């Protein structure tokens, strides 16, 4: 009569939905559980128009929108998405972070360990684009505000004691070739409008 999904699977999927992404580097006991029953999690998340996306190479699981069989809809208009659409200046910092991540990844090889970056290396990078207000305090506040807004997307942790930030591996999926191609096309369109 009554059939309950395996309590372990319920716990794992509830945590996965709560945080939005899961990792073996922090919650192995749940990452393995999800990685052993992907069909069950996919079908549980299917009604909500949410679908899992797996990454064995890095140890990352994440949930993503679906447009299948109800196509041609903006992803962010989905009802449950609780956070705003990415901002241009945020995507700039995303691109810089992704550049650092690819450098670290190709140096140490795709796999374990975390891609750390020091806050010092990011202030100069933005100094080119966003301009210089001649006040290290103000631009430091701006950079920290941007990083905090990105923590709401799950791309980076907050600065720790040594003023360093871990670039969460999900960034590799947020900015991949297809999305970057679309972004480049849109940016070129905007530049053309500007002319």
């Amino acid at each position: 009569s009554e059939t309950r999904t395996l309590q372990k699977i319920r716990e794992a999927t509830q945590e996965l939905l709560k945080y939005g992404l899961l990792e073996e580097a922090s919650k192995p006991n749940l990452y393995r559980i999800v990685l052993s029953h992907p069909e069950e999690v996919t079908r549980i998340l299917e009604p909500l128009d949410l679908d899992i996306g797996i990454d064995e190479i890095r140890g990352l699981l994440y949930v993503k929108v679906r447009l299948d069989e109800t196509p041609a809809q903006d992803e962010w208009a989905h009802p449950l998405v609780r956070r705003q659409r990415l901002n241009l200046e945020q995507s700039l910092l995303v691109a810089i972070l992704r550049q650092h991540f690819v450098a670290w990844e190709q140096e140490s090889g795709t796999g374990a360990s975390q891609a750390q970056i020091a806050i010092d290396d990011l202030l100069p990078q933005l100094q080119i684009y966003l301009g210089d207000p001649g006040s290290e305090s103000k631009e430091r506040t701006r950079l920290l505000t941007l990083l905090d807004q990105l923590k709401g997307h799950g791309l980076v942790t907050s600065p720790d004691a040594h003023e360093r930030i871990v670039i969460r591996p999900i960034i590799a999926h947020l900015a991949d070739p297809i999305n970057l191609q679309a972004l480049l096309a849109w940016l070129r369109e905007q530049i053309a409008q500007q002319t």
């Binding site: 797996i54 064995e56 190479i57 990352l60 590799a172 999926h173 991949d176 070739p177 297809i178 191609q181």
Partner: protein, 49 residues
């Protein structure tokens, strides 16, 4: 079309490859690797276990 579908099913190993004809070699290399080394090793481990 088929490259996009492969990406969809693909688990992480191809996150660094787009859906244009330029990247076909990466997909072919992935198939070659699966056929030659990864798949038989995983099958051997599975049978042993």
């Amino acid at each position: 079309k088929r490259m996009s579908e492969a990406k969809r099913v693909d688990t992480g190993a191809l996150v660094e490859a787009g859906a244009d004809l330029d990247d076909i070699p990466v997909y072919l290399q992935r198939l070659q690797e699966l056929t030659e080394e990864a798949l038989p090793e995983k099958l051997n481990r599975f049978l042993d276990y």
